[PDB]
Structures are given as structure tokens and as C-alpha cells.
Amino acid sequence: SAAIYNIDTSSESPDHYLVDHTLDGRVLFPATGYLSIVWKTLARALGLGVEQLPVVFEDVVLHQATILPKTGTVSLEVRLLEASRAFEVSENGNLVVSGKVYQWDDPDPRLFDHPESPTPNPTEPLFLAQAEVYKELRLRGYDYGPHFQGILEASLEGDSGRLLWKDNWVSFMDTMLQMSILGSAKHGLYLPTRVTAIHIDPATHRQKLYTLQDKAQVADVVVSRWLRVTVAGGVHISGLHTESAPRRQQEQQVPILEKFCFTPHTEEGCLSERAALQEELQLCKGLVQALQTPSQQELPRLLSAACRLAQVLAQERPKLPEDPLLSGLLDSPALKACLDTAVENMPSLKMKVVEVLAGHGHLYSRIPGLLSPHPLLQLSYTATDRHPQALEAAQAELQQHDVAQGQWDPADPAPSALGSADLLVCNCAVAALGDPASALSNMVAALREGGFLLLHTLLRGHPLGDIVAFLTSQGILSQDAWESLFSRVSLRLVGLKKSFYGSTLFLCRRPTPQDSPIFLPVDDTSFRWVESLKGILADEDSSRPVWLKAINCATSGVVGLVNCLRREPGGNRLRCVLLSNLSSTSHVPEVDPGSAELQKVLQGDLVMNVYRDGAWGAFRHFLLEEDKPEEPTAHAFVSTLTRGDLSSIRWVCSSLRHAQPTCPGAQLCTVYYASLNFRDIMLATGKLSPDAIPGKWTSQDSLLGMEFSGRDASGKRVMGLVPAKGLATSVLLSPDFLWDVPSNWTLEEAASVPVVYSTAYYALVVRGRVRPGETLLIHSGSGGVGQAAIAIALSLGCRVFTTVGSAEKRAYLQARFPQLDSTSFANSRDTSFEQHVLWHTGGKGVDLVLNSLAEEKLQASVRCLATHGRFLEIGKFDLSQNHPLGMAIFLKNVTFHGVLLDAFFNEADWREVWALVQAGIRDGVVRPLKCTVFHGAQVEDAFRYMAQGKHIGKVVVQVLAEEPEAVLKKLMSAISKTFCPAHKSYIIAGGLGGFGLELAQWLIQRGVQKLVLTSRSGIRTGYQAKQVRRWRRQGVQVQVSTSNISSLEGARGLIAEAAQLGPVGGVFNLAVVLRDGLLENQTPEFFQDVCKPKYSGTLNLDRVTREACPELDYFVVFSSVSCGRGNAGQSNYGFANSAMERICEKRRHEGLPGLAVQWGAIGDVGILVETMSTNDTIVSGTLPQRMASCLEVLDLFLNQPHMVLSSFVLA
């Protein structure tokens, strides 16, 4: 019968290693698992064991991938046709695997002999270790677990290595496949789809296994790309074909990205850039003036009702707090900054937050969402009101945020359950507090010592406040009255966020009795203050506050050090508070110590207190704008930001602007009209993998557009054929692929000729050899290639049979080509055309078939061939799927042509075809197609216009309108993309590290050709050597430098080496050393040697770039999120990061380039992952960000004006 295999990935299941075979986050059944189950079925059928049965698989095809569920079981049916020697593997009656399988009757041990390498005796002592091998594999999308990690050693090119034999036939062969795909230059996931022949002989496999010193038997694997053969032990795979597997967007982590910027404690004029708020305020003022003498919002409606005319106000009170003006600061960064300040001055991660009068406050829908990005914050929010029913309408909302409920009138003392709160939030803009003094006392008592009060209110004497008072005529209080009341209840104002229309967020703190503070200056360059800090923090009984001071050395990293010390066991409540004076300009005078400013700071007792350009405040995180930045550029292309989404189509800045290597053999042509082809939308809808297109293409560039029309460098009207990137504002092509647009033609019409007519001429004339008077069968005759072939054939006086799928297409073809008769047309949507042809050729058939159809239509087209018939395959589905073609049509002297006009871009002879097309232009044989023109801004519409298939002729995106002034005589808003000129040298300090190598690869893919990688010890690992070798082989001038940036002379020398290659355009500080440990373990030398790679190194890089790099474009430093928020155990790391950030802010303030990226945990590569953080484990509440996401985030960050940006992934 049929063998049933119940694949269960359970712990006690005998097949549990399969959970370790993870590809793009989904547990996929290995392609070798099917081979193993078929082998078991065959062994059962022939009565032998698996280890006693040498086997041969042939023409194995994998039709679909089986996803193993987390829980449950997948049933696989294996059916053997022994007489046919074939097998079949099905999931639920759906074909999964097909091929042939049979016993190896005469096993050949000589088949399992390692072929000689094409480049032998490499003399390379460096090989890829198992950790490096699987780091590289995981970078490509292969999350293989420990069971599927059998490659314990590999050569730098992947042609040879060692495979660990764990008595598993699935894992061993899967590691063979990993070895085959390791040396592949292709990028991304590549899953096996077809394997020509697998020969497995366990008899020689046992004898070819040798045990190492670890007593673990291994085999030697050799991959010959020349022979296309992988041999390991007794396994020999030949003809393995791997097809690209798109990476699922579900596995794509969504990272939270913030900007880390300075904000003063007192802010005024907030929300001024909001035009809607200004318009609403103007309308309210006009309504108030009319009463004394957008518009659909609650406040304008109430004002209009009052103008028309108590009852109305009572009815509209519930919707009053939701007004945009009354909630402007509630939906503003000021509230987020105040919340961050509150959670910053906290004993531990616990956050006890209580809201007063939540019925009209509506702070339950913003505060927990705003504090959600905090990774380790434990939030306890309680919504309280005098009347519980007022919260009923918000009940469901209170269920969404897990907010507790309670009853408490502000005029009465708080309940004991609500006492000792950490944060108290009120929104009394609409709600009435009653007696301000009694209430203020009530939640002064309710708040614990050191707690924070955040109240959003309206100020009397202001437009919004005056309007509210007039409408309502306890009540609206002025700022002076509010401050006096705060002083009455012993509240110290630490924050002030005032809008333009008067609404204000007051932040107050309850003072805590503290002894005389100890002032510790942490500005010493020798880092001798760390010993004093350890000594003062060595005691636990004393709780006297310790104020860190950084009056000198404005580029001090005290912020990161303090943030890291807060969550340490020593100093959580010992008040490790800082005082930094970071003046971004020398014009602003500094704040003298021992004066009233320090007294005010102590009175506020805010943990983060920085003086910047006259302002007193702190560095806070803010949510980054979700919109991708756009710039006006003359060079842009069309890209699908998310694969398969036609709505994601956008104009992205191209690499043709920053780098313009105008040299003979290439030409920068301005694109006026670019046509869309079938391949473009097979790319844009995800049906065709971008890597399937031949050519050296990176994983970032878009391949939309194979042809274009427009102007040239000299301004002549030209049209062109390109392998890719033709859908752009400008295109770089050789003149070998250029034709001159004739005067009678329009640039719009000419943008339809290149691809279709070149393909028709190559298939018909070059390969088909269409002699005049012959009989042709042209499929999709209404298409582009079809119309071109019809025109050529009618020029040659040929009988033509065009297959079209519509009556309108028939009519258009008849009108366009009057030489075609009613018998010239058949149906392309069914096999029927075959009979039609076989009827009108007298059963002889057609001489030439221009076939773009597939499957049964392809077979019918083959059956239409006459004797000496030429079959020109223009389509690719049956070619790509390796569909069998019956080799009996060749008995009719038939020649089968696989016509692909894509080898002309990576090989020649193309000129012949070129000449033909030019001839067709001269004779009038080449006639422009019908063009459906879409504007450049509507490109996506065009992409979804002909994908429906109703288009006739060609669809053309009008990138630029043709000027009628002459035939010989462009800024657009495009998404900013980071591209680097080839004439600039880019330095990556620490570029040989984990993040360094991947950043170098990303920069190289972005156009960097002169690269300088700085390492303290040069190349040591096989992975580093392999990456450097690949970069050098592909043309990048990567240079490994031992020069250390920690010394000024070392930085100068490094910049000199970079300038030797070319002008310095980018400096990337990724150097880092780890001296992590608790503060009592910390030593001054540890801080010195940690800050030297990062702080002193960045200072030296700053100085040298200022003095010797006038053309610098990128000055990027990679800090950690430990500085932004805090991580216990690494205080020196945080100090170095914060100092780097201050350096970058100083650089950016003066106009020079500067960027500090506060990375969270990095997943694919790094240092913490390689040592002991396998896969992506929750580290400090932040998940390890994947490298692809890291590179996209860096690309986004590099095109922003913000000095310091942070990115991490929530757990």
C-alpha cells in the first residue's frame, strides 16, 4: 500500500531534530527528509533495512514546502511505482515531491571519490569554523538549530569542508546542501527544488567516516560547482537546483525607532508648527468675538450652539476633553518627555501610576501606550473618578490597557490602596477639581516621597483659557496662581511645557528630605573619579545624595553612566544624579558652580540635569516619524518597498546621482518614457524572484524596467534596452543598446520598441531564421512581442496565425495588420488554437512557433510544429519548472529554441540583433506599439493597470514630458536612499567585527569602492578573511588597518591611509571592547580601555575629520541602547556611548555631519550573540534585532537631521 509517515516535532517524538531545521522562522520539512522517508519506504518494500540498501534518486522535484506545525502532526504519503521506478510524496492529496527511486544494484565506491578542486593547494590556513559558517548561513536566512549544524569546518569558498555525522541521514544530507549553497554568491534564502540524481551507499559511507580527537565520526564534503556535484561519505548529490524562496514579512521584526534629543525642562511655544491647531484657535477667537459683539470639532460646535442661543454645555461636556485644542499636548511629544522624566526618577522598574478624574481626563489611552516602548518598565495604571459610572463608557478601553479602576474624589483623602503612588496624573482642562488647595493637598499626601505629579490644565489670561472661562460663565486658574498653589502644598516644579494657546502640562515633585550632597566631579580625563565613586557607593546604610558634576569636558558621557548606575543594586535610591554642562556653542556662557543654578537643580532633584545653550533640561527619547524622508532629486527609480505589494511602489533615490562615472562604454541617459513589461510586474507582484534575473544585482536595488526612451548626454532623442533599472529618471547603459528615435516618431511611441522588437528579431531572424513565405504561429499576438513578430512576419510575406484571448484583441489586430485574415486568428486561452492551425495548414503545421504560453498550451504549440519546424520559447514558466518535453517532435527535424534576450547583457553578438532592429526602423518594418501613457506619479496605477491583462500594445510611464522645442536640446520628490560615490573612501573603525563586516557589506552594496577596515589585530577568523577576499575579488579596495583611533596620531595615520585611496567620505566608529561588571568590580583602567576605542577614538576622529576632511559626508558612531535607557553591569560602556553621542551632537550643531545610532541587541552577528546568546533570546527586555532590519534602520537613520537615533526590538 502507501506508506504513511507522521511527522511530529515533539520532545519525545523520534523526529524532534526537525524543529532545528528553521528557514525564515518557519520549521520546514527538509528536502532530505523526503529523501529519507522515500528511502525507508523503498527499504520496506524490498524487505531490507535502510542501512543495508544503497539507493538512487533521480529527477527529484519538490513541488511545495511542508510547514511542520508547532504542535500536531503532518501526514506524508509515500507511494512507490516499482515497475516505473518512481515515487510520490503527498501531504493531503497535494503533490509535494515527485521523482524516481530505486535500489543501486551495482554500487560504485569510485563514485564517492572527491573531485579535484579547480584551484588546488589554496595555501589558506584560515577556514570557516562551524560558528562562522552558521553565522553566515543565518545572515542569509537559515536559522539552523544544533541538530542541523553539522558543518564543523569549511573552506573560505565552500568547495570543501567537514560534515559531522550524528547517525542521521536527514541532517547529514541537509548539511551537504548547506555546503553546496554556502559558496554560492547568490543572496537570500535558496531552497532546493529539483535534484538530478542522489546516490547513497551506506556501505561506503560507514568506511568513509573517520573519528576526530573528539570521538565524533565525521566525513569530508567536497562541492564542485564545475561538475555540479556534492560528495560526502557515501552520499553523492548531482544536479541540485535551488530556487529563491521569498522571505516572509511575518518573520520581519518591527523595530521601535526613536530620536534621542535634548529637551529643556521649561518649554514654551509648543505645537506651533501645527496649522490645524492655529486654525481652530482662530475660529474659536472669531466665535468668541462674535458672541461678545476643523469647524466640526466639539469646541467649535459648542461655540456655534452658544452663538445660536447650560443644557447644551451639560450635554456636550462628555465630548469636550476630546477636542484637538484641549488635547494638543496630550498628543504631543511633551507628554512623552514628561512621562520619560517621571519613569527616569524611579527606584525600580515598578511604576505605580494613578489618574485623578479619569472620566474627563482620558489619560488612560495615551500614558500606557507611550510607556509601552520601555522594555523593562512594569506599569501599574489605575483610573480613578468620583463617579464610577463616568468610567463605564471607557470600560472596554480600560480592558485594553489593563488599567485598574477605583473611586476617589479629589476633595477627599485618597484610599489606602491608592496611596504611596509613584506617578499621579490629572487632566483638569474640562474636569472640575473643586477646591484647588484641598485637592492639591489630597494628592500631595497620596503621592509618596519623591513622586511626580503631572497635571494638564489651561492658563487664565490665555486665548483658550479665556474662551473656556467665557463659555463656562474653582475654574480656570492662572500660571501664577498654579505656582503659588504648588508652593503652598510643598511641590517643586521640575517641568514646564506651555503651548501657544495657553494649555500647559505642569510637572511637580514632592521633595524628599536629604542630607548634605556629595559633589563628585567626573570630568577627569584620567578616570580617577571612579575610585571615589566606588568608595562613596560602597556603603549601603547611608542614603545621602551624590551629585555627579561635569562642568568641564562638555563632551562628557555622564548621562550614560548615570543611566546605567540607576538600575545597579548600589545607587537605585542613593541618588546617583549628574550635572552636565554641554554647551553646543562657545558663544553661550557656561554656568558657574557653587551658585543659585546648582541650588535650583538640587531643589528640583532631577536625576538628569544638563545645561545646553542656556537651557536646563535632559536628553529624552521621542517617537520617530513613520514617513520615509524624501528629497528633491534629478535621479530616482521605481521600487516596491515591500515585495509583492503594488501599493508599495514608490520613487526611491538612485545611485546614479551620487556616483556619475561618465566614461566611454557607459552613458547617462535621461529617461522621458519608460515602458512596463511582463517581467516588471512579475517582479512587482512577487511572482518572479529578483535574483532569477541574470546579472550582478544586489539585494537592495530594484530591477523594474527593461527598456526606455528619452534624451542622451548630448541631448539627442534615443531609446534603449537595459537588463534592469530602466524604470527610472536616468539610466546608465552602454551605447551598444541604444537606437536613435527617428524624427517621425514621438519619444512616447519609441519607448515601446526595444524589448518587443529586439525579442521578435532575435527569436525570428537570428534563431528561427524566418525565410519569406513561411508559416508562423505567434502566441499572444495582441501583446508586445506578438505584435512585433506579426509585423516582422508580414514584412517577410509570411502566413501568420495569431492567438489572442479576446474579440477586441482580434479586432485591434485586424485593424492594425490588414494582411491578416479571419483565418489568421485563434484563441490563446485554450488548446483549441492547435486544431485551428492544424485545420488551416492542411494538417502540415506551422514552420515557426513563437510560444509565450505554458503547460498544455505549450504542448499544443509543440504539436503545431511542421517538419523542419522551429519552436522559439519566449516564455519561462515551463522552462523554469523543468516541465518534460516529449522528445518525439524532433523526429520531424524540429529545432527547439530557448529564446532568452537576457544573455545579451552579460556575454555579445547582440549587435546583430541591434542591426536588425535598426533595419526595421529604417524600412518601416518596426512600427511603434499602441502606448497607454501613465504619469510618473501614477506609476503604481500603471503597474496595476496591465497586470489585469486588458491592456493593448504597451503601457508607458511618462517620467518626463517630451519638449517640442527641439529634437537635440527634472527634480522629483523621491524617497531618500543612502548611496555612496565610488570616488570616496569610507573608514569603518572596528570594521572587522560582527557589525563591522555587515556594515561594510551594506556600504559596498551602496556603492562604496574604497574601504578601510580598522582592527586592533587584523584578520584572524575565517569569516573575516572570506568577506575581505570576496570584497577584493569584486573590485572593492578594502584595506585592513592596524592603526588605532584611540590615539590622535593613530587616527591621523588612519585618515592618511583612507585619503590615499580617495577623499574621505565616511567615518564609521564601531570599535568596542567589553569590561562589563558591577560598579564594585570596576577599575579606572577598565574605564580607560573601554572609553579609548569609543570616547577617545571618536574625539580623535572628530578632530582629524575637522582638520583634514572637508568632503566628509558621513560621521556615524555605533553606541548602544544601554546609554539611552540603562543596563546594569556596563557603566563604562554607557559612559563611552554617551560621550560619543555628545561628540556627535557637537559635530552636528556646527553643521558638520554627525550621527549616533543607539543600537539594541543585534541578532545575526555581534559579540554577545556569538559567545553564548544563541538564536534571539530576550536580553534586557529588547529582542536581538536581525541584521537585515538593522541595515534598513541604518539606511533610514542616515537620511535624517537628528543627531542621535535609537533602534531596538521589544521582547
Ligand SMILES: NC(=O)C1=CN([C@@H]2O[C@H](COP(=O)(O)OP(=O)(O)OC[C@H]3O[C@@H](n4cnc5c(N)ncnc54)[C@H](OP(=O)(O)O)[C@@H]3O)[C@@H](O)[C@H]2O)C=CC1
Ligand atoms: N524570453 C525572452 O527573451 C523574452 C520573453 N518575453 C516574454 O514574452 C511573453 C509575453 O511578453 P509580452 O508579449 O511583451 O507581454 P504583454 O504585456 O505585451 O502581453 C503578453 C500577452 O500575454 C497575454 N496575457 C496572459 N496573461 C496576461 C496578463 N496577466 N497580463 C497581461 N497579459 C496577459 C496577453 O495575450 P492574450 O491575453 O490574448 O492571451 C498579453 O497580450 C512573456 O512571457 C514574457 O516573459 C518578453 C521579452 C523577452
Ligand SMILES: NC(=O)C1=CN([C@@H]2O[C@H](COP(=O)(O)OP(=O)(O)OC[C@H]3O[C@@H](n4cnc5c(N)ncnc54)[C@H](OP(=O)(O)O)[C@@H]3O)[C@@H](O)[C@H]2O)C=CC1
Ligand atoms: N552587537 C551588539 O550587541 C551591539 C553592538 N553595538 C555596536 O555595534 C558596534 C560593533 O560592535 P560589535 O560588532 O557588535 O562587536 P565586535 O566585538 O564583533 O566588534 C568590535 C570590534 O571592534 C575592534 N576594536 C576594538 N578596539 C578597536 C580600536 N581601538 N580600533 C579599531 N577597532 C577596534 C574590536 O577589537 P579587535 O580588533 O581586537 O577585533 C573588534 O574587532 C559597536 O559600536 C558596538 O557598540 C551597539 C549595541 C549593541
